[PDB]
Each structure stands twice: as structure tokens, then as C-alpha cells.
Design an enzyme around this catalytic site. Structure first.
Site, PDB file in Angstrom:
ATOM      1  N   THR C  45      38.649  32.453  38.937  1.00 46.93           N
ATOM      2  CA  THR C  45      38.113  33.811  38.982  1.00 46.93           C
ATOM      3  C   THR C  45      36.603  33.795  39.185  1.00 46.93           C
ATOM      4  OG1 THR C  45      39.791  34.217  37.281  1.00 46.93           O
ATOM      5  CG2 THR C  45      38.427  36.078  37.973  1.00 46.93           C
ATOM      6  N   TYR C 109      48.294  42.808  39.261  1.00 50.98           N
ATOM      7  CA  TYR C 109      48.585  44.061  39.951  1.00 50.98           C
ATOM      8  C   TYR C 109      50.058  44.457  39.913  1.00 50.98           C
ATOM      9  CZ  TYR C 109      48.792  47.594  43.631  1.00 50.98           C
ATOM     10  OH  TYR C 109      49.017  48.745  44.351  1.00 50.98           O
ATOM     11  N   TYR C 135      47.508  30.597  32.945  1.00 47.37           N
ATOM     12  CA  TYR C 135      46.264  31.356  32.835  1.00 47.37           C
ATOM     13  C   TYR C 135      46.609  32.805  32.518  1.00 47.37           C
ATOM     14  CZ  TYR C 135      41.642  33.266  34.121  1.00 47.37           C
ATOM     15  OH  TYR C 135      40.425  33.910  34.127  1.00 47.37           O
ATOM     16  N   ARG C 140      42.296  41.632  33.475  1.00 51.74           N
ATOM     17  CA  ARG C 140      42.156  41.578  34.922  1.00 51.74           C
ATOM     18  C   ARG C 140      43.482  41.571  35.664  1.00 51.74           C
ATOM     19  NH1 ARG C 140      36.544  39.856  35.794  1.00 51.74           N
ATOM     20  NH2 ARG C 140      37.004  39.311  37.973  1.00 51.74           N
ATOM     21  N   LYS C 164      45.399  28.734  29.638  1.00 47.75           N
ATOM     22  CA  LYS C 164      44.006  29.123  29.559  1.00 47.75           C
ATOM     23  C   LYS C 164      43.941  30.557  29.064  1.00 47.75           C
ATOM     24  CE  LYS C 164      40.271  30.673  32.547  1.00 47.75           C
ATOM     25  NZ  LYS C 164      39.110  30.448  33.369  1.00 47.75           N
ATOM     26  N   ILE C 205      37.652  26.251  29.597  1.00 49.87           N
ATOM     27  CA  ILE C 205      37.314  26.433  31.004  1.00 49.87           C
ATOM     28  C   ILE C 205      36.257  27.529  31.024  1.00 49.87           C
ATOM     29  CG2 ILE C 205      38.087  27.145  33.285  1.00 49.87           C
ATOM     30  CD1 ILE C 205      40.890  25.966  32.346  1.00 49.87           C
TER      31      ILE C 205
END
Ligand SMILES: [Mg+2]
Ligand SMILES: [Mg+2]
Lengths: 296, 296, 296, 296
Positions: C45, C109, C135, C140, C164, C205
Site C-alpha cells: 500500500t 471494494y 493482510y 481501506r 499483517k 511491516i
């Protein structure tokens, strides 16, 4: 069911030298009557119920009851608490002082379950024989009265006739009136007064009406007479003042606005409420100048 | 600064025939003492503060103070309200019967601003000279004490020594202790007791400790001795009961568990709190059998 | 299981005149290696994955793989998509380009269900024979990989070795490692790096490591050596930069910081990302003042 | 300004043996045409845009454009991306294939700032000379297009004529139309179709219309004729199916409903989308039984 609907005002409680300005409280109620308000709500959230004594609670219900006597105006007295037995007492004591109905807020802080909310409100409704309007405001109470519980309480208790909704959730207001169109949905959120009325809502319990009772009165009655064009235009015109009256927690901005218009004598609150920041003081002031405020 | 830290229990208030079971209250406090608890918190949220009368408020603070006399265990009394005038009285009243300190919840329902929260707690701290612990639980109060307000109150009033965080925001707990490492951060959320302590927290005010006082006490003392492997190991074992104790609103699940363990006599609440649903009753019972529950 | 843990950096992707600055990309990777970083994450990202083409995607993986040759540093390449057939393809092509493992973002989305997330990652894990790190970043992606889905995927496919977590939910990180302590929980949220590591997390990360790789490296390694005091001390110190690096959406602030420190030549993004407001620009510059940024 | 308003359908994309059922696609679009729909939206969120190739993207726009030739119905093609360079490309790619306008969703996952959203849509608007409808759905994209950005884009770029709101925020819908009454507010949330239209919205882009196009058409046209009572009654009747079509993430329930009514061939999705659980299958199957589903 006996109901109390139309354009209603959540009255502020003016303080003078740390005490309730009883003469200004009554003069402010008369200002609401002469501007088309259908009912007044003493000692609601806007009236700083939390910091008033049980004797000041009693004093402002009596002033409200006495000022609207001989008029078509009703007194929907704030009488709620997060203890059901205390809430039952306040309901019986509001009735004994001449209130036409009671607004009873969802129990705050202790977050009751839906079953507990049912028994809580059921105990209140059986305490008196005057109309009871539920009050759902999850952002302040920490709990939500679900659509099922509102409808169950409306159908199971005869004097429970509707709900005051302050949830910013137009979906829930569709949910409520689609499954029980006989209930009285009341807007507790000034910015979305018209959408709630346009979906079948039958009244408002307003903060903005404290400052602009004529505009809130015209809005509600235009809507109830299905003149949505005139109702939508006042709702659109009022959006700026409707939002700026919540720059800080209600009733800090509305009391600041009433003081800036010269309708109360001192900008006093009871702690933990206090005067606003000096930007919000100025930014409330800059908005009021685009709205036209009736006097006494 | 004068402080109250370590493993602390937010005591349930057992009811029998609608009255406070005074014998079981004492019995339970001594059960906490004998399992390594450092302090007990009478009439907190878990103690159903909202539905007790002031005289009931006094009885359980006195019972706690007397049961812990001659022992190491301290008494952190619940003494808060959404009215400052009332919160000051409850703080003085608390000091009056031997409480070593007070836990004062952020004002609920009436949503004070950060400025109002400062004056609210400043009025309380200057009202007494016994330690005052702030209590932040936005999900119940509808308000948040910002890190700046917490730190200012810690620095400006000498008896304000920390905060009981129940917000599920480990970010705020690093924010708090990174900018003011001298404050006493207390976990008010059992599931994340160890992460809050591992970041420098100095105690917990727990709900789970009512049922498993030995395990919660050991967890806190494991952590305070920097044996984080053993502190994390108790926390991991407790996650299931820590979460199932909130299937419904606290203290409904913990009281059900205490009743199912035979530690109290009746599963009684005061409205609007009520008995749990029959599957959460079943789900509390099916997680309880995996833990070893100490008796009297 | 084969794993990739320790201090890891989500590399920014520097742009010059709308092109990927491949030489400056190589210089930022070298600076990461020489400051104790254990692995680098190209095209995450923070690397503006959404706006890079497939050769760009490939160019930064190959540069990363080649720059870490002869070193212990490993490459966990971002290779994910909200379309399973593309996510499988990007995984197979990341393996073909020398990546030691893949970071696979939760589908954004289109909000897959838990069943869909399971099959999505199962198809990816069976497509390649290199370690796969899940992840989860619901703010987001709009979806959450539940603890049960993460744990199921970890147990069913050998290459899925952890997740993550970027959800600001220390409760979920207790949930994950209490029910499956064999998984590798990796912090994707710089401000709470130490709490995640202190609960058994085995790496980060990081975004901040782009600017301060030595401090993030020291923090991660102190924690893995159970020197929790030192690990929390770097964490507490970085709190200010950790938060302001999100005054605007990542990687807008971090690229601003790298540009302000002279580590990249031009402050360029690909739309819809752009440079920040000049108050947040000025405001990022003011938190950098207390940190010591390593050069090349 | 050129606008595309009225009753619009977010077409599902039927798959058989993993590929787009082109013959059923055309037969569903004409089914929409023959039931009073004013425009169809190929490859929107309900059309599984994320998992279609750009050749199916082009295939489904052409079928829609070609099937509505000689008729009233317009084609508002989904053409958006979280990379401005792809959104500009897809917009030019939609126009060249005969689309009457484009629906462009706010960039997902990479969370652009308000200024970045402005330039993103500003770049798209200059790529084509066909109407552009903004599409705000923060629950899926992770970003929100503020009222100020929407109003700025409407006023600054000639072809940007409105927005498809899917945010469950009637307050924002008062905010939008009170400050810019010339814009076209389009409902992207079936349950609140009537409240959005009654506040000046001029159309819907519906999920339910896939299954019940006649009812959605009548709702929109009753409302646009200021016959709000008949629009509210259809909206109230549809609330249950409007909610049950989101028991799982769209378009999983609507495709299941279309399959149960015999309007599509296979209950196929492209991963990470999948068939629903047998609850949600049963709950979709039982809410459908109260509505009359038009055939071919
Ligand atoms: Mg309010
Ligand atoms: Mg949608």
C-alpha cells in the site's frame, strides 16, 4: 391512542447566578406559543436535565404547565432515568404536576438489553395513563432501542404512542413506519426534520426552534399539510444553523445563540457543561446573522 | 502522588429479594482478599451503581472498608456522576467512610466538552485529598476524555493519579504513557489486560476477577514483575471467558456466572438490567466449565 | 512452515517525471539493508500499488530481489487483488521474479464473505510454493478477515504462515495468538508496534522504517530478544512521528517526510494521490525535528 | 447540462461455466426495459466489475448499449478505478462503445484525499464529453467524497452532473441539495429510495430493480410526479427485500434471488465472491415469497 405531535421545542433552562431564571423560563415559553409551537418539552436533553435538582425538575414542569394553560399547547415533560424505578417515579410525578405526556430517554450508561429496555419502558407506561414518547439517542445513552422493541412497546402498551428519534439513520425511520405506520415518529435531529416528516413522521422536538420557533413551526405544518416544497425549503434554509448548533455539545451552542440574540440574560451552564470555545462562539455568531430571529 | 494500583475487582452487588445481600457482599470481598487481590472497587459499573440508592451506595462502601481493614487490600470507591455538583458530594461522601480513593467515571449522556471535563474533574479533585482515578468508557458515557485532558488533570491536580481505560484503544494507551509515563494506567477491559500492562500499565479494575480472582491477580502480578511470558499466558487462557462475559451488557454475564458457580444466591438485577437470554445463559455456562472456579 | 518475520519495510515507490525512479528505489533499499531491516515489501500500500503498471510491479520486485542479493534481507512482495484470478497470477509472477514470499491484501471494494476470503487465499496458497502472509486492513479494504478465517487458512495450507494486521484492534491480536499461537502475527500499524510484539507478534511491516529504519529495526529486535523495556522505549519515542505520518492518507505523509529529509528527489505521486495541504506539510516538517534521520 | 436520471438498474452479470452469459445478459436488460426502467448500469458494483476482464467490461457495455438501441433507456456505464489513469482510460473506453454516460466510483483502497478526489474526477471529466455521475460508497471504497468536493466538481467540470450516494446519510443528502439544488442526487441505497427522492433526488441506481424492476420504476415515477404517498407505499413494501438483499455483500443475495426466481441460469460468481450460506439462501427464499416477480 392519545398523542402529542406537531412542532415541539426542547426548552433550554436559563440560569441566573447559578439558579433557574423562572421569569425568563416562562417568557421563553410564551415566545414559543406565539410562534406556532404545538408543545414544549421541559427538562429534556436541551434543558440540562442531568444537572437540575428533582425540585428544579418540578419547578420547570409547573411553569410550562401553567404558561400553556388555556392554549392548544401541550407539555411533554422530560421524565426519564437509567433506573426504571426512578424513571417510574419521575413519570408519576410529572403527571401529578399537569404534564400532558412524558418524554422518557433510553437508559444511559448502564446499556440495558432489548429485553431490559422493554421491561423498563413497560414499567413506565403502566405507571401513568398519559402518553409516553420514547427517546432514542444512542450517541448519548450508549444503547439503541431496536425497531422491534419500539414496535413491541408501541403495540403492547396502550399509552406508548411513538418515538423521538435522534440517530441520523433514515433507514431506521423507514423500518419503523413501514412495519408500524400507526406510530408517531418524531424527529429529534433538526438537520433532517423534513426527511423524517416526508416519510410519515408527525412532528419535531427541536433545538433550533428555541432560536427560530416560527421557522420550525412553518416547516412542520407545511409538511403535515403535504406541502413538501415549502417544508423542504425551510429545512434547506435551516441547514447551516441546524449544524452550527452542534459545533459543541447541545445545549452549549443553542444557549450561546439565545444569549447572542438577547433572549436570555447570562450564558451560564451547570458543570460539566460550560461556555463554548471562542472560535465556536464567533462561528455561531456569524451564522445567526443570516437567520432572522423573532423577539418577545 | 498517592496511588492505588495492582489487581483490583469491580465488585458485583448481589441482590436477594430486591435488597442488597450484605452477607454475600462481605463474603465475596473476603474471597477476593484471600486470592491475592490488591484492591476492590465497590459500586462501579459492574456494581450497578446507577440503580442503587445513596444509602445502598454507603452500605457497600462501608462493608468493603470494614472487610478489608487490617489487610493490604485497598478500597477504590465508585463516586461519579454526570453532574459535577453531585459528583463532588459523592466524592466527599466516599472519603467520609474510609475509602482509600475514588473511581470517578466520565460524565455520561450529557457529553461535556474537553473544557467541561477538565473543570468537572478539577472540582472533584480539589473537593477531597484522597486519590482520584479517572474512568474513561466512551461506549457507555458517549464522551471521551482526550489524552490531553487526562494528562492535564494528572499534572494540574495532585490527587488525580491515573485513568481506568475501557475504550478498546491500545493506541491511546501508548499515547498516554508515551507523553506522561508517571501516570497510572489501569485496564478496565479484561481481554486486553496484559497488552495494557505490558505497555506500562500498573493495574486492572476487572470484571472477570469476580469469578476468577486468583487468575486475574496472578496475571497482574506476573506482569508487574516483568514476567510477561506468564502474564501473557494467563491472558490467553482467559480470552474466552473474558469475551463471553460481555455477550450481554456488563454486569449481566458476570452475575450469571457467579450464580452458576454457586457464589451468590439469586440471579437478581435491578431494572433496566435483567437476566440474560437463554442461550447466553447456556453460552456462559459452557465456557465456565473450562476454568477452575475458586470457592469460599 | 517457512516464514518471513522480523523488521520489515513497506517500501515507498519514488517517482520522477511520472516514472519510477529505479536508481532512487535501489538507493532506498540499500539504506534499509544497512539499518538492520530483515525484509522489504515492494509494491505494498505504501508503494502505491494501485497506480503502478505490471511492468512497474515487476520492475520494483526485481530491483528489490537484486538489491538484497548477497544479504540476509528477504523480499516479501505485494501480490494481491480483489479478483482471485489476478491475485493468483500476481502471486505466481512474484515467485518467478525471485520473491521470497508474498504479501496478499484482503480483497478491497467488493467485500467478499468469510467463505469467499477462505477460497480466495486458498487458491493463492496453492498457486505457489513460497510463504504467504495475509493482510487485513479493513479501513481501506472495507472487509475484515475474521480470526476464524485467518486461523483456518493458517492450518489448511502450509504457505500461509501469518497475517499483517492493520486494524487498530489489540483484542483481535489476543484472539488470534491465543487460539493459534503458532502463527506469525505481523504489525501493520506503526504506533502500536510494541503492543503487538509484546503479545507474541514476530515482526512489523512498517511505514516509519522508510524514514527511520534503524529505530524500527532496533525496536523489532529488542522485542524479539525479550528486551521489552528497550522496545517500548523506542515505541514511545516514535509515537509522534508514527501518528503524523497519517495526518493524510499513507503514503502521502511518508513521501513528504522522505522529500523533506532529502532522501528522494521529487515529491511526486500518481493520481488520485497528491501532495498534502501546506498545513499538514508544515505540520509533518515539525514532528521530524526531533528525530535523527539516517542518510545514505 | 446533460443528465441521466430516473429509474436505473445496476445490472448483475450472469456467469455460466465461468464466463459471462451474453445471451442471458441481453435478455435481462430488455426485461428491465419492458418494465419501465429508464437506464441500465453495466459492470457496476452489482455487476461484479472487480472480477470481469476488460474484454468482458467491453463486452457488457456493448450488449447494454446495443440492446437499448431504438428505445428510451440510456446506458450509464460503470467506468472507474482507484488509479486516475485507468479511470480516464475506461471513461474514454466507455464513450467509444456507445455509452450515454459513465458512473465512476470513488477510488477504493488507496484512500485519496479530498483534493486528490477533485483532480481524479476533474481528469476524468475532461477525457469525454458524456455525462459523469459520481459514485460515493465509503463502506466499500474506504474514502468519502465530501459535500464540498462534490459541489466543486459539479460546478467546475461541465459533464459532472450529480452523484450516486450509497452512504446511508440522509443528512449529507440535505447538505448536498440545500447548497447546490441543480445537481442530480441519485439513490444508491434501495431501502431509502423514497426519502432520497422526496428531498429532491432525481433517480435511483438500484439493486432490487434487477428482481422487481416494475416496482422500482413505479416508485421512482410516482415520486418524480410528486405523488409521494404512492412512492412511500412502494418503498415501504420493498423494505424487507431491500434489506434481505444485503444479508451478504452485494451482489451475492440479488444473484441468489435472480436464480431462485428462474431469471438466471446458474448461481455462479467469480471469486472471491461465492454462493451464500444456507441461512441466507433460506432467508432470501422466504422474503421473495411476498413479492410478485415479473418474468420474461
Ligand atoms: Mg441532543
Ligand atoms: Mg452497493
Amino acid at each position: 391512542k392519545n398523542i402529542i405531535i406537531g412542532a415541539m421545542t426542547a426548552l433550554i433552562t436559563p440560569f441566573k447566578n447559578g439558579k433557574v431564571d423562572e421569569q425568563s423560563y416562562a417568557r421563553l415559553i410564551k415566545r414559543q406559543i406565539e410562534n406556532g409551537i404545538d408543545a414544549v418539552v421541559p427538562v429534556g436533553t436541551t434543558g440540562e436535565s442531568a444537572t437540575l435538582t428533582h425540585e428544579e425538575h418540578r419547578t420547570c414542569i409547573e411553569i410550562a404547565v401553567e404558561t400553556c394553560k388555556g392554549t392548544k399547547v401541550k407539555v411533554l415533560a422530560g421524565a426519564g432515568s437509567n433506573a426504571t424505578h426512578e424513571a417510574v417515579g419521575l413519570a408519576k410525578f410529572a403527571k401529578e404536576h399537569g404534564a400532558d405526556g412524558i418524554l422518557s430517554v433510553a437508559p444511559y450508561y448502564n446499556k440495558p438489553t432489548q429485553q431490559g429496555l422493554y421491561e423498563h419502558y413497560k414499567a413506565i407506561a403502566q405507571s401513568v395513563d398519559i402518553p409516553v414518547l420514547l427517546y432514542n439517542v444512542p450517541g448519548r445513552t450508549g444503547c439503541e432501542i431496536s425497531t422491534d422493541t419500539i414496535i413491541k412497546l408501541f403495540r403492547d402498551c396502550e399509552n406508548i404512542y411513538g418515538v423521538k428519534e435522534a440517530s441520523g439513520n433514515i433507514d431506521k425511520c423507514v423500518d419503523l413506519l413501514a412495519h408500524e405506520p400507526r406510530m408517531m415518529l418524531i424527529s429529534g435531529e433538526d438537520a433532517i426534520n423534513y426527511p423524517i416528516l416526508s416519510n410519515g413522521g408527525k412532528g419535531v422536538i427541536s433545538v433550533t426552534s428555541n432560536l427560530l420557533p416560527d421557522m420550525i413551526s412553518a416547516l412542520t405544518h407545511f409538511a403535515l399539510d403535504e406541502n413538501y416544497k415549502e417544508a423542504k425549503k425551510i429545512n434547506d434554509e435551516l441547514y447551516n444553523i441546524n449544524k452550527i448548533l452542534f459545533c459543541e455539545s447541545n445545549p452549549i451552542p443553542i444557549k450561546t445563540a439565545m444569549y447572542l440574540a438577547g433572549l436570555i440574560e447570562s450564558l451560564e451552564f451547570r458543570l460539566p457543561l460550560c461556555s463554548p470555545s471562542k472560535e465556536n462562539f464567533a462561528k455561531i455568531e456569524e451564522v445567526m446573522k443570516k437567520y432572522k430571529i423573532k423577539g418577545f
